[PDB]
Amino acid sequence: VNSFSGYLKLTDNVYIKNADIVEEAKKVKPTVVVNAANVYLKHGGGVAGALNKATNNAMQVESDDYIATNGPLKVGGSCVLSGHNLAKHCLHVVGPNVNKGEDIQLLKSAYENFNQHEVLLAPLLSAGIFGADPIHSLRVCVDTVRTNVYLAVFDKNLYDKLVSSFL
Numbered sequence: 763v764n765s766f767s768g769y770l771k772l773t774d775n776v777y778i779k780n781a782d783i784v785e786e787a788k789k790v791k792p793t794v795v796v797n798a799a800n801v802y803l804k805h806g807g808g809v810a811g812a813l814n815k816a817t818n819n820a821m822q823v824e825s826d827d828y829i830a831t832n833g834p835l836k837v838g839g840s841c842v843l844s845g846h847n848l849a850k851h852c853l854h855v856v857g858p859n860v861n862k863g864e865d866i867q868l869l870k871s872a873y874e875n876f877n878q879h880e881v882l883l884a885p886l887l888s889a890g891i892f893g894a895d896p897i898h899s900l901r902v903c904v905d906t907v908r909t910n911v912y913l914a915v916f917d918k919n920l921y922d923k924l925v926s927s928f929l
């Protein structure tokens with residue numbers, strides 16, 4: 763039993779809710795919140811900008827030190843950093859950004875990072891300003907992630923389309 767509330771169950775291990783991931787993280791304090799990161803960990807907008815703003819820019823400060831030491835992530839890759847006031851840990855995952863021309867096949871690799879964590883609160887990778895079809899992202903999630911994932915979808919209209927079209 764865990765503390766996630768109000769989710770619709772899609773499969774054995776995937777759950778979904780119309781929610782603001784920032785507010786959801788603030789209330790649940792999950793072990794892992796996933797950020798929709800880019801390779802430079804520049805958290806300017808979308809989910810990343812919202813999560814970073816909620817940390818009062820501490821996420822960005824930590825991220826800048828990470829990049830200065832380690833260099834950029836790979837598209838499809840991830841790193842574990844602090845969850846600050848939102849979670850124990852933040853798993854920064856880089857899905858492909860269609861608006862930069864990156865290969866959508868890398869979306870499966872991106873979701874594979876979730877399998878290293880037993881339970882996660884996450885957004886749909888490559889959705890929103892990353893330009894992929896969220897219906898496709900949900901399908902890849904369900905077909906790739908085997909650990910327990912709680913998906914937060916900010917847009918109510920999109921949430922209803924994802925549920926109604928789910929096979």
Ligand SMILES: OC[C@H]1CN(c2ncnc3[nH]c4cc(F)ccc4c23)CC2(CCC2)O1
Pocket residue numbers: 781782783784807808809811812885886889890891896914915916917920
């Ligand atoms: O940029 C659009 C991208 C963002 N995503 C999110 N998902 C879950 N929680 C979210 N909280 C936020 C707070 C923000 F200020 C900005 C974005 C989010 C967000 C999923 C979607 C939005 C509909 C599909 O796309």
